[PDB]
Amino acid sequence: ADSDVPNDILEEQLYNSVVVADYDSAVEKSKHLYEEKKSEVITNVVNKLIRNNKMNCMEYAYQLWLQGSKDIVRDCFPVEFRLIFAENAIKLMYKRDGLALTLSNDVQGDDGRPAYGDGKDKTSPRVSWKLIALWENNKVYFKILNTERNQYLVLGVGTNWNGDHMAFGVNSVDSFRAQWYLQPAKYDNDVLFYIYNREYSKALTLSRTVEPSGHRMAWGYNGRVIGSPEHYAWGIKAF
């Protein structure tokens, strides 16, 4: 009888449940709350996780999605979380510039197609991406597939003077350089995500330098990103 527990208390223990990464328990309490009509408990927990930039939010959503609770992700989480986990075509839009992430037309080096924010285009099939979930080591990571080119996003192994790594599309996952993790954030009314490389733990960002073409190169950033989602974070929209 969850009716007999204050709502504030129900929020807290689900939230604690997620933050300590106890996912069977969070999924179990969630299935029960939803059942008894208490969905706002869940929605409040989700908003708290997003505001506090809680990485465990992603594991939470993904577990809900795998464990027969697609209904919960759909109802208590912003539409982004359904696009991620249903693996729908998305666009990745960099909050600071409003630029859409894409791969270059021309294959440069073994490196594959340099990635960058497109100075103009937010509509062509070049800008469509898929995020493909995997569970390992009690965490959730994603491969980021560019759908037109069928190439995966990665951080090159070399650095520039500042320790930043270029981002490219390549044909092959051999390594953690092709896998990423997400941290949710709230800006204005947006749900935004910091997007981190699994090998280097650096955030995917767009350079401040505009190319002669109007494009800005995509890098893994050597420096602090958190606390600045309008500079470092990505919004996710349906393609």
Numbering used by the authors: 1 to 239
Please give me the paper's original passages concerning this structure:
The study reports two crystal structures of Bmlp3, a protein belonging to the 30-kDa lipoprotein family found in silkworm hemolymph. Members of the 30-kDa lipoprotein family are the most abundant protein fraction in the hemolymph of silkworm fifth instar larvae. The Bmlp3 molecule consists of a helical N-terminal domain (NTD, residues 1–87) and a β-trefoil C-terminal domain (CTD, residues 88–239). The NTD consists of six helices forming a right-handed superhelix and is classified as a VHS domain.
All Bmlp3 crystals are monoclinic but belong to different space groups, P21 (Bmlp3-p21) and C2 (Bmlp3-c2). The starting model for Bmlp3-p21 was the structure of Bmlp7 and the molecular replacement procedure identified four protein chains in the asymmetric unit. The first important aspect is that each protein molecule traced in the Bmlp3-p21 structure contains all residues of the mature protein; it presents, therefore, the first complete model of a 30-kDa lipoprotein. The electron density was clearly defined for all N-terminal residues, which form a single α-helical turn. The asymmetric unit of Bmlp3-p21 contains four monomeric protein molecules, whereas in the asymmetric unit of Bmlp3-c2 two protein molecules form a dimer. In the Bmlp3-p21 structure, the NTD and CTD fragments are arranged alternately in a head-to-tail fashion, so that residues of the NTD have contacts with residues of the CTD. Although the protein molecules in Bmlp3-p21 are packed more tightly than in Bmlp3-c2 and the solvent content is lower, the results from PISA indicate that in the Bmlp3-p21 structure there are no specific interactions leading to a stable quaternary structure. The crystals of Bmlp3-p21 were obtained with PEG MME 550 as the main precipitant, whereas ammonium sulfate was the precipitant in the Bmlp3-c2 case. pH was also different, 6.5 and 5.5, respectively. In the Bmlp3-p21 structure this cavity is occupied by a fragment of polyethylene glycol (PEG) from the crystallization solution. Through its ether/alcohol character, PEG is a relatively good mimic of a carbohydrate moiety.
